[PDB]
Amino acid sequence: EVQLVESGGGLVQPGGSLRLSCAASGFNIYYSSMHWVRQAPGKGLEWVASISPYSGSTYYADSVKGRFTISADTSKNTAYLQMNSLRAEDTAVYYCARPWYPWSYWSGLDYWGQGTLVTVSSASTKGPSVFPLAPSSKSTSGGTAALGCLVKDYFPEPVTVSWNSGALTSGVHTFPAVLQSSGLYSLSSVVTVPSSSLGTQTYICNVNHKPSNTKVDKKVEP
Amino acid sequence: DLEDNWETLNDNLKVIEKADNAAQVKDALTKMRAAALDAQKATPPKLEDKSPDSPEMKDFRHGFDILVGQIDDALKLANEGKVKEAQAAAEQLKTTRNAYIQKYL
Amino acid sequence: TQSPSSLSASVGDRVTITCRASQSVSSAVAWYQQKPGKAPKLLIYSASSLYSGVPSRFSGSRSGTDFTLTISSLQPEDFATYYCQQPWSWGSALITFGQGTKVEIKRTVAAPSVFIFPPSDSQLKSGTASVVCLLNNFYPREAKVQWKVDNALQSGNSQESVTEQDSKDSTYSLSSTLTLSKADYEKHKVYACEVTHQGLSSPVTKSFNRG
Protein backbone atom coordinates (compact mmCIF):
# COMPACT_ATOMS: atom_id res chain seq x y z
CA GLU A 1 0.00 0.00 0.00
CA VAL A 2 1.45 3.32 -1.19
CA GLN A 3 1.47 6.20 1.30
CA LEU A 4 2.54 9.83 0.88
CA VAL A 5 2.80 11.90 4.07
CA GLU A 6 3.68 15.57 3.71
CA SER A 7 5.19 18.16 6.04
CA GLY A 8 7.07 21.44 6.05
CA GLY A 9 4.18 23.78 5.31
CA GLY A 10 3.37 26.66 7.55
CA LEU A 11 3.97 30.39 7.53
CA VAL A 12 6.56 32.41 5.63
CA GLN A 13 6.87 36.02 4.59
CA PRO A 14 7.03 37.30 1.01
CA GLY A 15 10.52 36.61 -0.28
CA GLY A 16 11.13 33.93 2.32
CA SER A 17 12.03 30.29 1.80
CA LEU A 18 10.29 27.10 2.78
CA ARG A 19 10.95 23.44 2.05
CA LEU A 20 8.12 20.90 1.80
CA SER A 21 8.60 17.19 2.42
CA CYS A 22 6.81 14.32 0.71
CA ALA A 23 7.67 11.17 2.69
CA ALA A 24 7.05 7.98 0.70
CA SER A 25 6.18 4.57 2.14
CA GLY A 26 5.29 1.35 0.33
CA PHE A 27 7.63 1.79 -2.66
CA ASN A 28 11.17 2.89 -3.48
CA ILE A 29 11.02 6.61 -4.37
CA TYR A 30 14.05 6.06 -6.62
CA TYR A 31 11.89 4.33 -9.23
CA SER A 32 8.99 6.74 -9.62
CA SER A 33 8.07 10.17 -10.85
CA MET A 34 7.03 12.45 -7.99
CA HIS A 35 4.89 15.52 -8.70
CA TRP A 36 3.89 18.62 -6.75
CA VAL A 37 0.38 19.95 -7.36
CA ARG A 38 -0.88 23.05 -5.53
CA GLN A 39 -4.26 24.68 -5.07
CA ALA A 40 -4.85 28.23 -3.86
CA PRO A 41 -7.73 28.85 -1.40
CA GLY A 42 -10.90 28.38 -3.42
CA LYS A 43 -9.22 27.85 -6.80
CA GLY A 44 -8.25 24.79 -8.84
CA LEU A 45 -5.40 22.34 -9.12
CA GLU A 46 -2.18 23.63 -10.64
CA TRP A 47 0.71 21.31 -11.44
CA VAL A 48 4.02 22.76 -10.30
CA ALA A 49 6.98 20.39 -10.68
CA SER A 50 8.00 16.78 -11.13
CA ILE A 51 11.17 14.70 -10.74
CA SER A 52 12.13 11.21 -11.85
CA PRO A 53 14.81 10.50 -9.21
CA TYR A 54 16.53 7.52 -10.89
CA SER A 55 17.13 9.56 -14.04
CA GLY A 56 17.24 13.07 -12.60
CA SER A 57 14.83 14.39 -15.22
CA THR A 58 13.04 17.40 -13.76
CA TYR A 59 10.20 19.64 -14.93
CA TYR A 60 8.60 22.87 -13.71
CA ALA A 61 5.57 25.01 -14.40
CA ASP A 62 6.40 28.49 -15.69
CA SER A 63 4.84 30.15 -12.62
CA VAL A 64 7.58 28.70 -10.37
CA LYS A 65 10.48 28.26 -12.78
CA GLY A 66 13.67 29.66 -11.29
CA ARG A 67 12.12 29.97 -7.82
CA PHE A 68 11.25 26.37 -6.88
CA THR A 69 13.48 23.31 -6.95
CA ILE A 70 12.20 19.74 -6.69
CA SER A 71 14.53 16.97 -5.48
CA ALA A 72 14.60 13.61 -3.77
CA ASP A 73 16.64 11.86 -1.09
CA THR A 74 16.33 8.15 -1.77
CA SER A 75 17.87 7.05 1.54
CA LYS A 76 15.19 9.05 3.32
CA ASN A 77 12.69 7.93 0.63
CA THR A 78 11.23 11.45 0.44
CA ALA A 79 10.93 14.14 -2.22
CA TYR A 80 11.23 17.87 -1.57
CA LEU A 81 9.99 21.18 -2.97
CA GLN A 82 12.44 23.98 -2.17
CA MET A 83 10.45 27.24 -2.48
CA ASN A 84 12.50 30.43 -2.74
CA SER A 85 11.45 34.02 -3.45
CA LEU A 86 7.91 33.21 -2.35
CA ARG A 87 4.96 35.55 -2.99
CA ALA A 88 1.37 35.82 -1.79
CA GLU A 89 0.09 33.99 -4.90
CA ASP A 90 2.08 30.98 -3.74
CA THR A 91 -0.41 30.66 -0.85
CA ALA A 92 -1.90 27.21 -1.38
CA VAL A 93 -2.35 23.68 -0.14
CA TYR A 94 0.55 21.79 -1.74
CA TYR A 95 0.04 18.11 -2.65
CA CYS A 96 2.53 15.53 -3.82
CA ALA A 97 1.40 12.88 -6.28
CA ARG A 98 2.76 9.90 -8.15
CA PRO A 99 1.51 7.84 -11.13
CA TRP A 100 1.21 4.06 -11.41
CA TYR A 101 4.48 3.64 -13.28
CA PRO A 102 7.29 6.24 -13.25
CA TRP A 103 6.36 6.97 -16.88
CA SER A 104 2.54 7.00 -16.70
CA TYR A 105 2.02 10.58 -15.46
CA TRP A 106 0.01 11.41 -18.59
CA SER A 107 -2.53 8.67 -17.79
CA GLY A 108 -3.20 10.01 -14.28
CA LEU A 109 -1.74 10.56 -10.82
CA ASP A 110 -2.90 7.60 -8.72
CA TYR A 111 -1.49 8.40 -5.28
CA TRP A 112 -1.73 11.70 -3.43
CA GLY A 113 -0.37 13.10 -0.23
CA GLN A 114 -2.75 14.67 2.24
CA GLY A 115 -1.51 18.18 1.44
CA THR A 116 0.08 20.88 3.57
CA LEU A 117 -0.99 24.53 3.77
CA VAL A 118 1.54 27.27 2.94
CA THR A 119 0.55 30.82 3.84
CA VAL A 120 2.68 33.64 2.47
CA SER A 121 2.11 36.88 4.36
CA SER A 122 4.11 39.45 6.27
CA ALA A 123 1.57 39.27 9.12
CA SER A 124 2.68 37.98 12.53
CA THR A 125 0.68 35.30 14.30
CA LYS A 126 -1.97 37.05 16.35
CA GLY A 127 -4.98 35.76 18.26
CA PRO A 128 -8.46 37.01 17.42
CA SER A 129 -10.78 39.51 19.04
CA VAL A 130 -14.24 38.08 19.75
CA PHE A 131 -17.28 40.37 19.85
CA PRO A 132 -20.89 39.43 20.55
CA LEU A 133 -23.71 39.55 18.01
CA ALA A 134 -26.58 40.08 20.44
CA PRO A 135 -30.10 38.91 19.54
CA SER A 136 -32.49 41.66 18.45
CA SER A 137 -34.78 42.64 21.31
CA LYS A 138 -37.65 42.85 18.78
CA SER A 139 -37.67 39.36 17.27
CA THR A 140 -40.66 37.03 16.81
CA SER A 141 -42.49 36.94 20.15
CA GLY A 142 -42.53 33.13 20.05
CA GLY A 143 -40.53 32.42 16.91
CA THR A 144 -36.83 32.29 16.03
CA ALA A 145 -33.94 34.44 17.27
CA ALA A 146 -30.42 34.73 15.86
CA LEU A 147 -27.24 35.39 17.85
CA GLY A 148 -23.56 34.87 17.24
CA CYS A 149 -19.93 35.90 17.66
CA LEU A 150 -17.63 38.01 15.48
CA VAL A 151 -14.08 36.64 15.46
CA LYS A 152 -11.94 39.50 14.18
CA ASP A 153 -8.30 40.28 13.31
CA TYR A 154 -6.43 36.96 13.67
CA PHE A 155 -3.61 35.38 11.69
CA PRO A 156 -3.20 32.72 10.39
CA GLU A 157 -6.02 30.38 9.63
CA PRO A 158 -7.73 28.53 11.21
CA VAL A 159 -10.04 29.25 14.14
CA THR A 160 -12.51 26.78 15.63
CA VAL A 161 -15.87 28.00 16.91
CA SER A 162 -18.22 25.91 19.03
CA TRP A 163 -21.25 26.80 21.10
CA ASN A 164 -21.92 25.78 24.70
CA SER A 165 -18.85 23.53 24.41
CA GLY A 166 -20.54 21.26 21.83
CA ALA A 167 -23.95 21.08 23.50
CA LEU A 168 -25.11 23.50 20.76
CA THR A 169 -24.78 22.32 17.17
CA SER A 170 -28.21 22.46 15.49
CA GLY A 171 -28.57 25.76 13.68
CA VAL A 172 -24.88 26.68 13.97
CA HIS A 173 -23.32 28.42 10.95
CA THR A 174 -19.62 29.31 11.15
CA PHE A 175 -18.74 31.29 8.06
CA PRO A 176 -15.58 31.14 5.96
CA ALA A 177 -13.05 33.69 7.10
CA VAL A 178 -12.48 36.66 4.83
CA LEU A 179 -9.02 38.18 4.40
CA GLN A 180 -9.28 41.81 5.49
CA SER A 181 -6.98 44.28 3.73
CA SER A 182 -4.88 44.54 6.90
CA GLY A 183 -3.71 40.98 6.23
CA LEU A 184 -5.69 39.55 9.16
CA TYR A 185 -8.69 37.27 8.91
CA SER A 186 -12.14 37.75 10.38
CA LEU A 187 -15.23 35.55 10.41
CA SER A 188 -18.56 35.24 12.16
CA SER A 189 -20.38 32.28 13.66
CA VAL A 190 -24.15 32.37 14.18
CA VAL A 191 -26.83 30.13 15.65
CA THR A 192 -30.60 30.39 15.56
CA VAL A 193 -32.50 29.60 18.77
CA PRO A 194 -36.07 29.68 20.06
CA SER A 195 -36.98 33.26 20.96
CA SER A 196 -38.32 31.96 24.29
CA SER A 197 -34.95 30.57 25.40
CA LEU A 198 -33.34 34.02 25.29
CA GLY A 199 -34.30 35.05 28.82
CA THR A 200 -33.50 31.66 30.38
CA GLN A 201 -30.96 29.57 28.45
CA THR A 202 -27.31 30.62 28.25
CA TYR A 203 -25.31 30.92 25.02
CA ILE A 204 -21.49 30.98 24.99
CA CYS A 205 -19.26 30.74 21.93
CA ASN A 206 -15.89 29.01 22.35
CA VAL A 207 -13.28 30.40 19.97
CA ASN A 208 -10.01 28.49 19.74
CA HIS A 209 -7.06 29.78 17.67
CA LYS A 210 -4.38 27.08 17.95
CA PRO A 211 -1.61 28.94 16.02
CA SER A 212 -1.41 31.70 18.68
CA ASN A 213 -2.59 29.51 21.59
CA THR A 214 -5.56 31.80 22.19
CA LYS A 215 -8.92 30.57 23.44
CA VAL A 216 -11.76 33.01 24.06
CA ASP A 217 -15.10 32.04 25.60
CA LYS A 218 -17.51 34.94 25.13
CA LYS A 219 -21.06 35.02 26.48
CA VAL A 220 -23.79 36.45 24.24
CA GLU A 221 -26.97 37.96 25.70
CA PRO A 222 -29.40 40.77 24.83
CA ASP B 1 17.22 16.79 -41.33
CA LEU B 2 14.00 16.68 -39.29
CA GLU B 3 11.99 14.07 -41.21
CA ASP B 4 14.96 11.69 -41.10
CA ASN B 5 15.28 12.25 -37.35
CA TRP B 6 11.71 11.04 -36.86
CA GLU B 7 12.30 8.05 -39.16
CA THR B 8 15.13 7.12 -36.79
CA LEU B 9 12.92 7.48 -33.71
CA ASN B 10 9.94 5.60 -35.16
CA ASP B 11 12.10 2.78 -36.50
CA ASN B 12 14.12 2.36 -33.30
CA LEU B 13 10.97 2.41 -31.19
CA LYS B 14 9.85 -0.65 -33.16
CA VAL B 15 13.28 -2.17 -32.51
CA ILE B 16 12.72 -1.86 -28.75
CA GLU B 17 9.25 -3.45 -28.95
CA LYS B 18 10.54 -6.39 -31.02
CA ALA B 19 13.88 -6.75 -29.20
CA ASP B 20 15.33 -10.12 -28.15
CA ASN B 21 18.16 -8.93 -25.90
CA ALA B 22 18.89 -5.97 -23.65
CA ALA B 23 21.71 -4.81 -25.96
CA GLN B 24 19.10 -4.19 -28.66
CA VAL B 25 16.97 -1.84 -26.55
CA LYS B 26 19.93 0.15 -25.20
CA ASP B 27 21.47 0.66 -28.64
CA ALA B 28 18.04 1.66 -29.93
CA LEU B 29 17.47 4.21 -27.16
CA THR B 30 20.95 5.67 -27.72
CA LYS B 31 20.13 6.17 -31.41
CA MET B 32 16.80 7.75 -30.47
CA ARG B 33 18.39 10.22 -28.06
CA ALA B 34 20.72 11.62 -30.71
CA ALA B 35 17.96 11.91 -33.31
CA ALA B 36 15.79 13.68 -30.73
CA LEU B 37 18.59 16.06 -29.69
CA ASP B 38 19.30 16.53 -33.40
CA ALA B 39 15.69 17.40 -34.24
CA GLN B 40 15.51 19.93 -31.39
CA LYS B 41 17.95 22.19 -33.28
CA ALA B 42 15.95 22.03 -36.53
CA THR B 43 12.94 24.20 -37.50
CA PRO B 44 9.88 22.66 -39.19
CA PRO B 45 7.79 23.99 -42.08
CA LYS B 46 4.91 25.34 -39.97
CA LEU B 47 7.46 27.71 -38.38
CA GLU B 48 9.63 28.31 -41.48
CA ASP B 49 9.79 32.06 -41.11
CA LYS B 50 9.34 32.43 -37.34
CA SER B 51 11.99 34.05 -35.16
CA PRO B 52 14.22 31.59 -33.25
CA ASP B 53 13.23 33.51 -30.11
CA SER B 54 9.49 33.39 -30.82
CA PRO B 55 6.92 31.52 -28.71
CA GLU B 56 6.48 28.94 -31.49
CA MET B 57 10.20 28.11 -31.55
CA LYS B 58 10.43 28.05 -27.76
CA ASP B 59 7.53 25.57 -27.85
CA PHE B 60 9.27 23.49 -30.52
CA ARG B 61 12.47 23.09 -28.52
CA HIS B 62 10.55 22.65 -25.25
CA GLY B 63 8.61 19.66 -26.56
CA PHE B 64 11.90 18.00 -27.41
CA ASP B 65 13.01 18.51 -23.81
CA ILE B 66 10.16 16.14 -22.93
CA LEU B 67 11.00 13.61 -25.66
CA VAL B 68 14.67 13.58 -24.64
CA GLY B 69 13.74 13.32 -20.97
CA GLN B 70 11.46 10.34 -21.62
CA ILE B 71 14.21 8.68 -23.68
CA ASP B 72 16.77 9.39 -20.94
CA ASP B 73 14.30 7.75 -18.53
CA ALA B 74 14.13 4.59 -20.62
CA LEU B 75 17.91 4.60 -21.11
CA LYS B 76 18.50 4.81 -17.35
CA LEU B 77 16.15 1.91 -16.67
CA ALA B 78 17.91 -0.13 -19.35
CA ASN B 79 21.40 0.77 -18.09
CA GLU B 80 20.26 -0.28 -14.60
CA GLY B 81 18.92 -3.65 -15.76
CA LYS B 82 15.24 -2.65 -15.54
CA VAL B 83 15.05 -3.60 -19.19
CA LYS B 84 11.39 -4.63 -19.28
CA GLU B 85 10.58 -1.30 -17.60
CA ALA B 86 12.70 0.53 -20.18
CA GLN B 87 10.56 -1.10 -22.87
CA ALA B 88 7.26 -0.04 -21.30
CA ALA B 89 8.75 3.41 -20.74
CA ALA B 90 9.45 3.68 -24.47
CA GLU B 91 5.80 3.06 -25.35
CA GLN B 92 5.11 6.49 -23.85
CA LEU B 93 6.97 8.15 -26.73
CA LYS B 94 3.96 7.29 -28.89
CA THR B 95 1.91 9.81 -26.90
CA THR B 96 4.73 12.36 -27.24
CA ARG B 97 4.96 11.58 -30.96
CA ASN B 98 1.20 11.98 -31.44
CA ALA B 99 1.38 15.45 -29.87
CA TYR B 100 4.06 16.33 -32.43
CA ILE B 101 2.16 15.22 -35.54
CA GLN B 102 -1.02 16.84 -34.19
CA LYS B 103 0.71 20.22 -33.83
CA TYR B 104 3.17 20.44 -36.75
CA LEU B 105 1.51 18.38 -39.50
CA THR C 1 -6.25 31.93 -10.63
CA GLN C 2 -9.58 30.35 -11.68
CA SER C 3 -12.54 29.30 -9.56
CA PRO C 4 -14.53 26.13 -10.28
CA SER C 5 -17.64 26.31 -12.40
CA SER C 6 -20.83 25.23 -10.68
CA LEU C 7 -23.68 22.99 -11.76
CA SER C 8 -26.94 22.09 -10.01
CA ALA C 9 -28.34 18.57 -10.27
CA SER C 10 -30.60 16.17 -8.38
CA VAL C 11 -29.90 12.63 -7.23
CA GLY C 12 -30.50 10.22 -10.09
CA ASP C 13 -29.60 12.83 -12.72
CA ARG C 14 -27.31 12.07 -15.66
CA VAL C 15 -24.49 14.62 -15.87
CA THR C 16 -21.74 14.90 -18.46
CA ILE C 17 -18.82 17.26 -17.93
CA THR C 18 -16.84 18.35 -20.98
CA CYS C 19 -13.21 19.43 -21.09
CA ARG C 20 -11.84 21.07 -24.23
CA ALA C 21 -8.47 20.22 -25.77
CA SER C 22 -6.56 22.27 -28.33
CA GLN C 23 -6.24 19.24 -30.64
CA SER C 24 -7.48 15.69 -31.09
CA VAL C 25 -7.61 14.64 -27.48
CA SER C 26 -5.94 11.23 -27.64
CA SER C 27 -6.09 8.85 -24.71
CA ALA C 28 -3.66 10.39 -22.19
CA VAL C 29 -6.20 12.29 -20.09
CA ALA C 30 -7.60 11.75 -16.60
CA TRP C 31 -10.51 12.74 -14.36
CA TYR C 32 -10.27 13.51 -10.64
CA GLN C 33 -12.85 13.94 -7.87
CA GLN C 34 -12.34 16.23 -4.87
CA LYS C 35 -14.41 16.89 -1.75
CA PRO C 36 -13.63 19.82 0.59
CA GLY C 37 -10.67 19.33 2.89
CA LYS C 38 -9.47 16.29 0.94
CA ALA C 39 -6.99 15.53 -1.81
CA PRO C 40 -8.38 14.71 -5.27
CA LYS C 41 -9.04 11.08 -6.11
CA LEU C 42 -8.32 9.48 -9.48
CA LEU C 43 -11.61 8.46 -11.09
CA ILE C 44 -10.87 7.75 -14.75
CA TYR C 45 -7.40 7.14 -16.17
CA SER C 46 -6.32 6.89 -19.82
CA ALA C 47 -9.49 8.65 -21.04
CA SER C 48 -11.84 5.75 -20.33
CA SER C 49 -10.33 3.31 -17.80
CA LEU C 50 -12.21 2.99 -14.51
CA TYR C 51 -9.86 3.28 -11.54
CA SER C 52 -10.23 0.65 -8.86
CA GLY C 53 -13.09 0.99 -6.42
CA VAL C 54 -14.81 3.60 -8.59
CA PRO C 55 -18.50 2.78 -9.22
CA SER C 56 -19.46 1.80 -12.75
CA ARG C 57 -21.82 4.81 -12.98
CA PHE C 58 -18.73 6.89 -13.73
CA SER C 59 -17.47 6.62 -17.29
CA GLY C 60 -15.04 8.52 -19.45
CA SER C 61 -15.14 8.94 -23.20
CA ARG C 62 -13.45 10.97 -25.91
CA SER C 63 -14.62 12.40 -29.24
CA GLY C 64 -12.68 14.70 -31.56
CA THR C 65 -11.17 17.60 -29.62
CA ASP C 66 -13.40 16.91 -26.60
CA PHE C 67 -13.45 14.32 -23.84
CA THR C 68 -16.07 13.79 -21.19
CA LEU C 69 -16.84 12.51 -17.72
CA THR C 70 -20.34 11.05 -17.39
CA ILE C 71 -22.10 10.05 -14.17
CA SER C 72 -25.05 7.97 -15.33
CA SER C 73 -27.08 8.41 -12.12
CA LEU C 74 -25.87 10.98 -9.57
CA GLN C 75 -25.69 9.53 -6.07
CA PRO C 76 -25.64 11.73 -2.94
CA GLU C 77 -21.92 11.14 -2.38
CA ASP C 78 -21.09 12.19 -5.98
CA PHE C 79 -21.67 15.87 -5.16
CA ALA C 80 -18.09 17.08 -5.30
CA THR C 81 -15.73 18.99 -7.55
CA TYR C 82 -14.39 17.33 -10.68
CA TYR C 83 -11.11 18.07 -12.45
CA CYS C 84 -9.81 16.90 -15.81
CA GLN C 85 -6.13 16.47 -16.65
CA GLN C 86 -5.63 17.99 -20.09
CA PRO C 87 -3.75 16.06 -22.78
CA TRP C 88 -0.18 17.14 -23.33
CA SER C 89 0.50 19.33 -26.34
CA TRP C 90 3.93 19.93 -27.81
CA GLY C 91 5.86 22.52 -25.81
CA SER C 92 3.27 22.59 -23.01
CA ALA C 93 3.87 22.12 -19.31
CA LEU C 94 4.18 18.46 -18.42
CA ILE C 95 0.76 18.26 -16.71
CA THR C 96 -2.17 20.68 -16.93
CA PHE C 97 -5.49 20.55 -15.06
CA GLY C 98 -8.75 21.95 -16.34
CA GLN C 99 -10.80 24.59 -14.58
CA GLY C 100 -12.84 22.42 -12.27
CA THR C 101 -16.57 21.74 -11.96
CA LYS C 102 -18.52 21.74 -8.69
CA VAL C 103 -21.72 19.67 -8.69
CA GLU C 104 -24.26 20.94 -6.14
CA ILE C 105 -27.64 19.70 -4.97
CA LYS C 106 -30.70 21.17 -6.64
CA ARG C 107 -33.50 21.90 -4.19
CA THR C 108 -36.64 24.01 -3.96
CA VAL C 109 -36.44 27.79 -3.63
CA ALA C 110 -36.13 28.87 0.00
CA ALA C 111 -36.17 32.47 1.12
CA PRO C 112 -33.59 33.61 3.69
CA SER C 113 -34.37 34.68 7.19
CA VAL C 114 -32.62 38.03 7.66
CA PHE C 115 -31.09 39.38 10.89
CA ILE C 116 -29.00 42.50 11.52
CA PHE C 117 -26.60 43.06 14.42
CA PRO C 118 -25.22 46.41 15.64
CA PRO C 119 -21.60 46.56 16.79
CA SER C 120 -20.90 45.62 20.37
CA ASP C 121 -19.76 48.15 22.93
CA SER C 122 -16.52 46.18 23.34
CA GLN C 123 -15.67 46.75 19.69
CA LEU C 124 -16.63 50.43 19.67
CA LYS C 125 -13.99 50.82 22.38
CA SER C 126 -11.41 49.63 19.83
CA GLY C 127 -12.21 52.35 17.28
CA THR C 128 -14.04 50.17 14.73
CA ALA C 129 -17.69 49.33 14.20
CA SER C 130 -18.77 46.08 12.52
CA VAL C 131 -22.40 45.92 11.47
CA VAL C 132 -23.27 42.33 10.58
CA CYS C 133 -26.13 41.06 8.43
CA LEU C 134 -27.22 37.41 8.35
CA LEU C 135 -29.10 35.62 5.56
CA ASN C 136 -30.03 32.23 6.97
CA ASN C 137 -30.88 28.93 5.23
CA PHE C 138 -31.75 30.08 1.71
CA TYR C 139 -31.59 28.53 -1.79
CA PRO C 140 -30.47 29.24 -4.48
CA ARG C 141 -27.04 30.70 -3.69
CA GLU C 142 -27.65 34.03 -5.47
CA ALA C 143 -28.50 36.78 -2.98
CA LYS C 144 -27.92 40.54 -3.05
CA VAL C 145 -27.27 42.52 0.13
CA GLN C 146 -27.55 46.31 -0.10
CA TRP C 147 -26.12 48.30 2.82
CA LYS C 148 -27.91 51.61 3.53
CA VAL C 149 -26.54 54.03 6.14
CA ASP C 150 -29.15 56.75 6.79
CA ASN C 151 -30.62 55.90 3.35
CA ALA C 152 -27.24 56.53 1.67
CA LEU C 153 -26.59 53.37 -0.33
CA GLN C 154 -23.13 51.96 0.34
CA SER C 155 -20.48 50.27 -1.77
CA GLY C 156 -16.85 49.38 -1.18
CA ASN C 157 -16.99 49.07 2.62
CA SER C 158 -18.40 45.57 3.19
CA GLN C 159 -17.35 41.94 2.77
CA GLU C 160 -19.42 38.78 2.32
CA SER C 161 -19.01 35.09 3.04
CA VAL C 162 -21.18 32.11 2.11
CA THR C 163 -21.31 28.70 3.72
CA GLU C 164 -21.23 25.50 1.75
CA GLN C 165 -24.55 23.79 1.12
CA ASP C 166 -25.88 22.52 4.42
CA SER C 167 -25.62 18.76 4.84
CA LYS C 168 -29.20 18.45 6.09
CA ASP C 169 -31.35 20.91 4.09
CA SER C 170 -29.00 21.85 1.20
CA THR C 171 -29.39 25.58 1.92
CA TYR C 172 -26.80 28.35 1.99
CA SER C 173 -26.17 31.10 4.50
CA LEU C 174 -24.44 34.43 3.97
CA SER C 175 -22.85 36.94 6.34
CA SER C 176 -22.26 40.54 5.28
CA THR C 177 -20.06 42.81 7.38
CA LEU C 178 -20.19 46.57 6.93
CA THR C 179 -17.13 48.06 8.62
CA LEU C 180 -16.95 51.72 9.64
CA SER C 181 -14.63 53.69 11.85
CA LYS C 182 -16.10 54.41 15.27
CA ALA C 183 -16.15 58.13 14.40
CA ASP C 184 -18.04 57.40 11.16
CA TYR C 185 -20.46 55.08 12.95
CA GLU C 186 -21.50 57.78 15.43
CA LYS C 187 -22.17 60.38 12.72
CA HIS C 188 -25.18 58.33 11.53
CA LYS C 189 -28.41 56.93 12.95
CA VAL C 190 -30.30 54.41 10.77
CA TYR C 191 -28.41 51.30 9.63
CA ALA C 192 -30.32 49.09 7.18
CA CYS C 193 -29.59 45.76 5.49
CA GLU C 194 -31.69 45.25 2.35
CA VAL C 195 -31.86 41.68 1.05
CA THR C 196 -33.10 40.57 -2.37
CA HIS C 197 -33.33 36.93 -3.42
CA GLN C 198 -35.36 34.79 -5.82
CA GLY C 199 -37.47 33.59 -2.87
CA LEU C 200 -38.54 37.12 -1.87
CA SER C 201 -41.41 38.72 -3.78
CA SER C 202 -39.99 42.10 -2.74
CA PRO C 203 -36.82 43.07 -0.86
CA VAL C 204 -36.56 42.45 2.88
CA THR C 205 -34.93 45.24 4.90
CA LYS C 206 -33.69 44.91 8.46
CA SER C 207 -32.42 47.85 10.44
CA PHE C 208 -31.78 49.47 13.80
CA ASN C 209 -31.34 53.00 15.14
CA ARG C 210 -28.09 53.80 16.90
CA GLY C 211 -29.17 54.00 20.56
Coordinates of C-alpha atoms in Angstrom, one line a residue, chain B residues 30-71:
Chain B
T30 CA 21.0 5.7 -27.7
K31 CA 20.1 6.2 -31.4
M32 CA 16.8 7.8 -30.5
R33 CA 18.4 10.2 -28.1
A34 CA 20.7 11.6 -30.7
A35 CA 18.0 11.9 -33.3
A36 CA 15.8 13.7 -30.7
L37 CA 18.6 16.1 -29.7
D38 CA 19.3 16.5 -33.4
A39 CA 15.7 17.4 -34.2
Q40 CA 15.5 19.9 -31.4
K41 CA 18.0 22.2 -33.3
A42 CA 16.0 22.0 -36.5
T43 CA 12.9 24.2 -37.5
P44 CA 9.9 22.7 -39.2
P45 CA 7.8 24.0 -42.1
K46 CA 4.9 25.3 -40.0
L47 CA 7.5 27.7 -38.4
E48 CA 9.6 28.3 -41.5
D49 CA 9.8 32.1 -41.1
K50 CA 9.3 32.4 -37.3
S51 CA 12.0 34.1 -35.2
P52 CA 14.2 31.6 -33.3
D53 CA 13.2 33.5 -30.1
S54 CA 9.5 33.4 -30.8
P55 CA 6.9 31.5 -28.7
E56 CA 6.5 28.9 -31.5
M57 CA 10.2 28.1 -31.6
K58 CA 10.4 28.1 -27.8
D59 CA 7.5 25.6 -27.8
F60 CA 9.3 23.5 -30.5
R61 CA 12.5 23.1 -28.5
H62 CA 10.5 22.7 -25.2
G63 CA 8.6 19.7 -26.6
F64 CA 11.9 18.0 -27.4
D65 CA 13.0 18.5 -23.8
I66 CA 10.2 16.1 -22.9
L67 CA 11.0 13.6 -25.7
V68 CA 14.7 13.6 -24.6
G69 CA 13.7 13.3 -21.0
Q70 CA 11.5 10.3 -21.6
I71 CA 14.2 8.7 -23.7

